[PDB]
Amino acid sequence: LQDVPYWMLQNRSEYITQGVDSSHIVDGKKTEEIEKIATKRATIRVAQNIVHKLKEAYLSTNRIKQKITNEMFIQMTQPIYDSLMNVDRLGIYINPNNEEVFALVRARGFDKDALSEGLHKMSLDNQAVSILVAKVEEIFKDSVNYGDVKVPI
Numbered sequence: 001l002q003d004v005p006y007w008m009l010q011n012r013s014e015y016i017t018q019g020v021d022s023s024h025i026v027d028g029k030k031t032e033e034i035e036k037i038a039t040k041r042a043t044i045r046v047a048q049n050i051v052h053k054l055k056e057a058y059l060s061t062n063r064i065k066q067k068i069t070n071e072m073f074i075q076m077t078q079p080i081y082d083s084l085m086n087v088d089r090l091g092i093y094i095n096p097n098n099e100e101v102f103a104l105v106r107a108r109g110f111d112k113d114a115l116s117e118g119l120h121k122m123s124l125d126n127q128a129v130s131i132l133v134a135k136v137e138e139i140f141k142d143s144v145n146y147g148d149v150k151v152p153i
Contacts, residue, residue, distance in 0.1 A: 001031070001094040004102050007151050008093065016053055017143040018090070018106045019045030025099040038103040039089050046107045047081035054135055066128045079118025080136065085109040090148055106148060110136060 008020055021041035023034045055073045058064055086108035093102045112133060119129040 001092060001101070004093040004095050005151075008102060008104065010152075013049065013052075015106075015143075015146045015149065016049045016139050017046060017108075018104065018146070019043060019049060020102065020104050021045050022095075022100050022102045025101065031101065034101045035092055035103065038092070038101045039105060042089075042103040042105040043084065043087050043107070044077075044081060046084060046087070046105065047077050050080050050136060050139060051077050053139060054132060057135055064128050064131050066125050068124070068128065072122060072124070075122055076119065076132075079115055079122075080110070082118060083110045083112075083115040085111055088148075091150065104150070106143075107140075109140060112137060 012018060012020060019042040021038055021044070023038040023041060025031070025034055029037075051073055054076065055068075055070075058068060058073075084107045087105050088108060089103055089105050091104035093104075094100070095102065115136060116129060116133050119132055124132070
């Protein structure tokens with residue numbers, strides 16, 4: 001395993017459909033296992049980045065009429081995560097100081113009908129669900145501009 005690069009330590013919130021997370025080496029787990037854990041966490045981070053962007057676009061030029069609270073935004077994380085598809089690990093690295101494994105992942109897509117169904121089972125009205133799902137689609141469409149970038153251009 002290569003050492004974590006500086007770019008993994010920089011703010012990468014612009015790369016919404018990419019996620020970076022980590023796992024320490026743990027008692028009686030070997031590296032391959034820890035890598036699976038870091039990668040799952042990295043994928044959960046993608047869902048959290050999307051939620052953050054939805055909350056951001058809400059609290060702007062928002063068109064959503066309904067009140068959506070912080071708790072409701074948090075509660076969107078699972079339905080988004082559940083809908084993610086074709087999540088590629090772009091990179092796996094080790095921190096030399098503490099043995100901690102870091103993963104970089106990118107979600108290439110999401111299952112739009114699954115997300116819709118999930119949001120419809122929260123207290124989100126029809127218009128809210130439609131705009132939110134639209135916004136997730138736009139995030140994915142727009143993600144081609146960064147794509148699989150590692151070292152930023």
